[PDB]
Amino acid sequence: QDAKAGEAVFKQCMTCHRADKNMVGPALAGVVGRKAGTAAGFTYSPLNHNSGEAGLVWTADNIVPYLADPNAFLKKFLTEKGKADQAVGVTKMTFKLANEQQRKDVVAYLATLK
Numbered sequence: 001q002d003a004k005a006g007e008a009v010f011k012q013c014m015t016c017h018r019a020d021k022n023m024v025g026p027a028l029a030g031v032v033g034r035k036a037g038t039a040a041g042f043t044y045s046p047l048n049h050n051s052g053e054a055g056l057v058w059t060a061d062n063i064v065p066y067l068a069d070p071n072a073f074l075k076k077f078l079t080e081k082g083k084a085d086q087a088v089g090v091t092k093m094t095f096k097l098a099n100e101q102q103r104k105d106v107v108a109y110l111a112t113l114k
């Protein structure tokens, strides 16, 4: 949860994400507190879209497990909602971050991206 240390991890995310405009992935400013699949103008996968529709709001706590394995997280979320059929597809985000400390730190960074 060291946002400064998260800066170095965030450089990887900058391959596809910008704070304020969409790119390969959606704009991330204000992602902490945002309903999944709702960045204006971005076309999400059904998996991410359906997760937000089922109520997923990204928080400082749940983005951490998400980054370890985006597909597993979103599939598990929808399955827990009794919506496993809406989780058959995969996310467009083909990146994963195995290290837990790196995930905690980059999510602390995200929380400062207002």
Ligand code: HEC
Residues within 6 Å of the ligand: 009, 010, 012, 013, 014, 015, 016, 017, 024, 025, 026, 031, 034, 035, 036, 037, 038, 039, 043, 044, 045, 046, 047, 048, 049, 058, 063, 067, 090, 091, 092, 093, 094, 095, 097, 106, 110
């Ligand atoms: C390109 C190879 C990517 C990299 C590197 C990272 N992300 Fe990404 N991300 C990408 C796409 C194409 C998408 C849309 C997913 C879909 O299925 O539509 C995403 C999405 C996210 C989200 C969800 C945002 C939302 O509005 O619901 C988050 C929280 C996210 N990405 C975070 C994130 C971070 C912190 C990264 C560096 C650790 C990162 N992504 C890398 C593409 C790519």
